[PDB]
């Protein structure tokens, strides 16, 4: 299992995409589809996992496990414990004999129950990933489970979902405020679009691999507004304007 | 004068974003309004300009002049001669003292005239990029303009409008796949949405400048498509969404 690295000190426009870079070439198979890295292919019950190791304001570390088949957070350790989501696959060889399982599982409906908060109304920046990293950092059983799935939806957001998508990446970089010093990092929070780019991504990854001549089979439609919906049709526009970086294998 | 350069060689997503960050950085004067750099008033002298000196595929270049006040081409020089757009003030310091006038502004509007093609189905991307800087650097007068004008359009878009809007810069470094040897670049065509966010530089930088507590006195209504709209109504949804990166200075 290799590991990613990324520190939030000192952190530019550069050195955040240069980590998502990263990122995707070891979450990658090394083949690309259509222009796009293609993830790989599970293997029978094989896991294929990869680590991505998060410092935060104080150089405190926690280390997210993710899932190459999907690039999505399946477990983190912090303070060498592991702390896996309820569906998570056991692993004990990874894991050790006894992590410790939470009640929920990753998806954003149980998180945001568990956070008690829509991640419509969570800030996404700098600031808040470290805050998310110090906050699972120190974060121990008994206490209750919801600043876990709150920084959890942070995280998953900052590193999962802007490696699947350029164009919440963008958002990221858009506010890594790097022509002052010192730097100043500003927050934004996902809206509809957003949310809807991110929950048709298996939707897109298909219709890239099963497009004839660039050509989607199966047109997808995505909110722009509450009221409006665009429509992706080819995979030019997959990349161009949703800014798909990794592919699910289908 | 001051002077990026950028060549088309060897680009990736990170040369061709350093390249606008670098760009973005002579541009500003400086000073920040909710955290986007805010362009000179102009002063009347040489301070005023940025030079951008671009490289084709066989290191040809050409310098284009920028001016700082609104990020946006006056001129450029190809083989030791300047030209210069219509409306371009003379200047025997910067241009020489025999540079050629083009009969045009830099408008889109003229631009597209004299191309004979509108911007939406002009290719956009390194090689469209290298061809535009080629073509600039063999035109000589008097061989109709039509080809300056379409290579203007290439330039204007990937290097002012890019240095302008990050949402636009990332449409660009999309298509940059450098995770694959050789590196391939492809092109796109820019979208109605992404027409509409350059014609709306103006109206959002003077909304930035205005806003109270961050919000919109005037929200700005965007096209994303032909159909489709979305409403830009505070600072932060402009630098975020749009990825405005410069103000043009209100004004």
Same mark, same amino acid.
Not at 102 to 110: D, E, I, Q, R, V
Not at 167 to 178: G, L
Not at 183 to 198: A, E, H, K
């Given at each position: 299992?290799?590991?990613?690295?990324?520190?939030?000190?000192?952190?530019?426009?550069?050195?955040?995409?240069?980590?998502? !870079?990263?990122?995707?070439?070891?979450?990658?198979?090394?083949?690309?589809? @259509? %222009?796009?890295?293609?993830?790989?292919? !599970?293997?029978?019950? !094989?896991? %294929?996992?990869?680590?991505?190791?998060?410092?935060?304001?104080?150089?405190?570390?926690?280390?997210?496990?993710?899932?190459?088949?999907?690039?999505?957070?399946?477990?983190?350790?912090?303070?060498?414990?592991?702390?896996?989501?309820?569906?998570?696959?056991?692993?004990?060889?990874?894991? #050790?004999?006894?992590? @410790?399982?939470?009640?929920?599982? #990753?998806?954003?409906?149980?998180? =945001?129950?568990?956070?008690?908060?829509?991640?419509?109304?969570?800030?996404? #920046?700098?600031?808040?990933?470290?805050?998310?990293?110090?906050?699972? @950092?120190?974060?121990?059983?008994?206490?209750?489970?919801?600043?876990?799935?709150?920084?959890?939806?942070?995280?998953?957001?900052?590193?999962?979902?802007?490696?699947?998508?350029?164009?919440?990446?963008?958002?990221?970089?858009?506010?890594?405020? %790097?022509?002052?010093?010192?730097?100043?990092?500003?927050?934004?929070?996902?809206?509809?679009?957003?949310? %809807?780019? !991110?929950?048709?991504?298996?939707?897109?990854?298909?219709?890239?691999?099963?497009?004839?001549? #660039?050509?989607?089979? =199966?047109?997808?439609?995505?909110?722009?507004?509450?009221?409006?919906?665009?429509?992706?049709?080819?995979?030019?526009?997959?990349?161009?304007?949703?800014?798909?970086?990794?592919?699910?294998?289908?």
């Amino acid at each position: 299992i290799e590991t990613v690295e990324f520190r939030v000190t000192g952190t530019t426009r550069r050195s955040y995409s240069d980590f998502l !870079q990263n990122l995707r070439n070891r979450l990658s198979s090394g083949t690309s589809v @259509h %222009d796009i890295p293609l993830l790989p292919a !599970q293997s029978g019950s !094989q896991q %294929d996992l990869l680590f991505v190791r998060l410092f935060d304001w104080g150089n405190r570390p926690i280390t997210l496990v993710l899932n190459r088949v999907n690039a999505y957070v399946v477990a983190y350790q912090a303070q060498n414990r592991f702390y896996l989501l309820s569906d998570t696959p056991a692993n004990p060889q990874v894991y #050790g004999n006894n992590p @410790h399982r939470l009640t929920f599982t #990753g998806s954003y409906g149980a998180l =945001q129950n568990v956070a008690k908060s829509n991640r419509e109304n969570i800030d996404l #920046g700098i600031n808040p990933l470290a805050t998310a990293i110090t906050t699972l @950092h120190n974060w121990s059983p008994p206490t209750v489970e919801t600043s876990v799935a709150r920084s959890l939806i942070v995280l998953i957001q900052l590193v999962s979902e802007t490696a699947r998508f350029r164009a919440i990446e963008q958002r990221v970089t858009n506010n890594i405020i %790097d022509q002052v010093t010192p730097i100043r990092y500003d927050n934004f929070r996902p809206r509809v679009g957003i949310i %809807d780019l !991110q929950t048709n991504w298996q939707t897109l990854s298909t219709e890239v691999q099963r497009a004839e001549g #660039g050509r989607f089979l =199966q047109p997808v439609k995505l909110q722009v507004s509450v009221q409006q919906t665009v429509v992706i049709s080819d995979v030019e526009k997959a990349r161009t304007f949703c800014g798909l970086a990794l592919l699910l294998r289908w």
